[PDB]
Amino acid sequence: MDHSLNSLNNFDFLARSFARMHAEGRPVDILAVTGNMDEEHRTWFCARYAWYCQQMMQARELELEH
Incomplete structure (x- = not known):
């Protein structure tokens, strides 16, 4: 959707989870x-x-990513 609203929000929360x-x-x-x-x-x-x-x-089975 948006690089600052959707991609940016994921980049922060996923940064620590990445x-x-x-x-x-x-x-x-x-x-x-x-x-x-x-x-x-x-x-x-x-x-x-x-x-x-x-x-x-090896993760592709029930969920795609999160």
């Missing part, structure tokens, strides 16, 4: 974080690309 779901292996919508695209997000998604790739493919 790192928490990284060790737990839970589905996290990184795309929401890539919509704005940040300089630190480049190297961040490098390790979060593979992580989300193996945890989401």
